[PDB]
């Protein structure tokens, strides 16, 4: 190592962010020529790529402005593009690429590439031995440096590689993070799905649902299992609401022109129609401009009616004729609705109500009529003289109620009059017989809210046919009774009986308009408008769900209600247990609890798209013969495929074989690949037009050796379709190893690397060296015992060492008599010159324990020391005297005193 | 036996109904007599003032005969004098009923059957229901019936006062809309 | 006989500045004017009210500014002129502004945090602060994160961050943002959550011809350019496969699969006509969309990048003719101008393609940079509908591949058969801010009342709000007059110029004739934002090297910067923010529904987006649809 930068001095590049420069700045510098210039200092990321920067400005006068993207290029003379997979299956050998790119004109670089030691990966590199290679990169060229790594534990592991240039001060280090995932599969199961809906099939209290832990039969040990609970709402709203065509009621507009009675007859349909369209907002299809004309006509009719105002604030068709109580009641009722439409005078309404109260008041709650109206059809439902004291007083009370809100401070006697009228109404309510009279009385008494108990039962039972209020008379009477009943039910907030009456009223096909139809049209339109205004679709959700989880001490409370967009709720829990959910409130909801985790890898986890045959044999330069090919399991020949072969270090392909195979049909080799071997040919690519899915008609070729390196990296083979890389099949081969798989000692899912020397070292060894090597920090237990029995297993040799006598006991306080298990490779037996039925002194580390407390199976690694003890009768030999004396002195020294450390 | 549980549930429901429905309703119906007697007295006074007042043209009363005016004034004054004496009886009764209702509400707050809802009666059934049921929470139930009967008597006093007031109240309103039309002295005095 | 008239926007907006125009024909002396606004459902709430005075010094022209304090909402605006009250009903739109969502990266991986920004603007693109609700929805449509933010002193910029859970399904995620006052309108952006590894180079496929002629025996030539993300070229092997697509068809061609050695980042492939015919009649391929999928593998075999271009049209003509920017009505006895738009088969503008008409072939106008050409033809005073055909006259091209388009032009429905016509003409080009447009007004009417017209009232419409209003003076004997209208930054992207004049006819009837024209201006940002490298003499920076960035923009402007790796755009690039998209969105929000005049004055006013109400009875048809008729 001359003129070579030390590995310590080399700094590795780790920061590889996919996006940065997430800063906010304001342009406040002194502008020049209407332009403000701002200078910023930034640090370029270590990643070698093209950075695109987009700037968006928002000025207080110009607005949003997007500038053209700016491209920044980061360049280096020589660099490395370390390619790793996003995730690597645990306990599965994987291959990664370290491609070195050089862009010099006519300079050839002799580079040294090294991989740092990572405890989480079982690579060829060791603490004492460094896995490094030497390569030659010609000018303007890229050279691949594949590396094989076997992941051990899951998590965000890091892989670091370095490259150094000979005779130059150039060095590049690349460190990249990869997420090692435990072997398995992304599988999810539906833990449970239930419906949360109280007040149906529930209980007097609150529904409770207990969700037990999921199965998780194939759950990988020590893997997170996140449980997601989703609460979903179903705000169904469809009751078949039906309106009335606005274009078919155009005949309802009438110009108000008459001597009081006729003027009101004309005006009432217009005002009620205007109110109906205003409530339903049907002016879009009825004519927006016509509303102005309707309002003009309404105000003209109102002024005309005022023209006949009596001195005492009363209303009559003729000034000379005495006023009529029913006529003024209808007057005030009509004016009450039109308060919001036109600029009505509150003084007139107050005077009218005061006159009505003061004329005859309610000494007992009875209204008397003295001046019958000239038009006998105006009364309509009041034509019958049967219990007229009920219908008349109820109608007058309703009229007062409509106008109560406007004129309330001027007259304070309205509440008392209302109470007296009520008391009279309920005084003899049992005597009502006619359906119309009962309906009007119920509607009048419903506004106050004191028509309950037997009154409500009587009102409901009066409904003939369960869906109509019919009497033996004209259709006008039935329509008025139905409107009264609909209004009463709407005021009572009894929605379970509204849809039928509304449906029948819609189906009645009655629009009115003409002679003796003002009352029916007015009432039906008012009832329809009231229903449209007050008809909430469904019961607003009020769910209050409490989730109790044993892991979480505090319950999780969630509220789901309408008009808040909260019908969709999600919760997550890191622990899966037998939790509970308690519902509450009014509404409908559904819970879905689903658990996500990592299932067991099973045995089907393979390539699943190709069956790969790879073999290596010796020659009949070693010049081995290597065979690689694949078979398709499908029903038809696959498309073009690519085979990538990474040869072991020091091995190259045969140029003659490649040249001979190039002319073969159905097979092509790139020209650049053919002319090679100037520096190395580790990576080879073959393009196959098709692969037979029925027979294995493939080839084999010779591979030569040019450089001899100990611990040759196992060769790798990959095959993948040109149109899909996920369906790539990989294999490993090695002349010595059975299938090119790195040796490791594993129990259950816990595996540890085994690519290490069988022992520290073996001669000039003396007592001082033995003492120095026997006093390491890891030296905990030293045993001198006779190895007799040895067992063979399918993975590694097992030796049953019987405790003849204990010299020093470490963490494990084992007495004399028990037997221990030592797991070592069969090959290491010759390295340690172990012999059956012979005495040996061994001591190892404290972290080498394999198994549970009861099962302390030991592992003989590169740190465990084992030495041969000559037999009692074998020390007599002259050459063994020194060794026996040294062993005895070492044993006596440690036993009496022991290693200071 | 389940009969005891049903009776207990019925008694609880009746007590709740009395506490939340009858108690509140009863008080609101006792303070209205005072507001009606004064209102009718004011209306009678206004009617008397309008008769032969600073101006005329008061519908038919303007042309009313001189002799009939004296009788109308006399009867109006008699009715006004008669109706005044009833005010204190209702005024005291209102406050008494309010205080008793407050006490009963406080006492109530201190403390199978569904098919029987047809009874719809919670007037004096608590004590009798407890009587059949017998054949810490029991002690307050004893005075509830007594308080309810006292409230009923207090309300009956005001009801009787209001009913008596009607005798003098109705006569003035009659002669009003009798003379209000074209009715001469004859019928008027004949009925008076 | 004074006549009072009012001009109002067709659609009003809440808490948005609005202007109303008041005018009076044949008025003497000063007159006070009062303006009142009422809410249609109640007609009592007073949203706003203002009054002013009109004087003869301004030729009885007034502008009044009103703003709404803030099931289609409607309002009623009433103007009282002292002796005449004119009330008009106007629809009100609930839209308050625009929301733009900017994402740091187009594609995200599990665990990585997602940082985004929300920009709130008004209909004038100015910064406006308001409460905005934001939701994050997974591909299946289950909102996971919901927030309700507000901006007061942030100049409309709201940054937000979200944490992606470790276990998340792969697919297309969405981020939606909407103003609280307008829950029915939502702006949504879509990004990808898919496992991926950043590549090392970008591959592009470029067809030699943007189209593929049916009779081209040579075939279709496609060049594959693979280049490293840092600029250096790429050498490897590229597999290219062609296919047909009628939308959701994706019919691949197994016989078209080809492999080429990409040397120095260059590779050419040819698709023969015979192969295309065998894959599927020659004339039956019209309308089929060709697509090519190319996969490039490096000689090292360590990285693979897939690039494909889909949607190459197959047409018999290299150019297409459209009349989308041409009025559908003509004035008899007046010259008729067709703004013929020539476009490439893909959709891009043409390249100086001559256009001519079958009749009066002497006219030969070459398309400009915008691809729009003016075709002027003399029209007879006849009243029957006109039929006009447009072809292509490209040189060195046979008649088989020439384009074709026939259209019908209806007569202008004159009111009362008074044969009064007003024509507005403007030269067409890519206008820039600060340029002056010499508009030409021409009048055609009977000589009996040619001395009565004295001025034309003109208005400018842009982004709904009335940009400007004024008068152009006219004198007897001047049939043609020139208006040098000024264009400034307040314009862009497009605006409508309307001009009208009113007169009393033979029967003493108030008749108003109006004409509207469409003016197209080059699309550009209101301000001027530029980002570059501060250093003026330096080599390509090495990793981790300090650099200076120079940003030029308007003073007191909130500037937000973001850096995205180029390799990210290689995989997915559909989600991108640019001024062109903003301008397109703004144009799509225009209330106009015709690129020119209509049937009558009321139709012209309705199309232009303005309601013109007179005191004599003239009025425009009410509009109750937010979107234009389809």
Author numbering:
A (entry chain B): 752 to 1371, 1381 to 1522, 1525 to 1663
B (entry chain C): 35 to 145, 203 to 226, 256 to 312
C (entry chain A): 23 to 92, 102 to 311, 315 to 664
Quoted from the paper:
The ISG65:C3 complex could be reconstructed to a reported FSC0.143 of 3.58 Å, while ISG65:C3b was reconstructed to FSC0.143 of 3.59 Å. However, the local resolution range across the reconstructions varies significantly, especially for ISG65:C3b. The local resolution in the CUB and TED region varies between 4 and 5.5 Å, while at the interface and in the remainder of ISG65, it ranges from 5 to beyond 10 Å. The higher variance in local resolution across the ISG65:C3b reconstruction is likely caused by increased flexibility of the extended domains CUB and TED relative to the MG-ring. C3b could be modelled except for the flexible regions Asn93-Gly101, Gln312-Leu314, Pro665-Ala667, Ser749-Leu751, Glu1372-Ala1380, and Ser1523-Asp1524. Minor rearrangements of the TED and the CUB domain, especially in residues Gln1161-Pro1287, can be observed in C3b and may be caused by ISG65 binding. In addition, the electron density corresponding to the head domain of ISG65 also suggests contacts with the CUB domain of C3b. Should this interaction occur in a physiological context, the second attachment point could restrict the free movement of the TED.
We show that only convertases of the AP but not of the CP/LP can form on the surface of T. b. gambiense and that ISG65 is capable of specifically inhibiting the activity of the AP C5 convertase in vitro. The TED of C3 is the main site of interaction with ISG65, whereby its helix bundle follows the curvature of the globular TED.
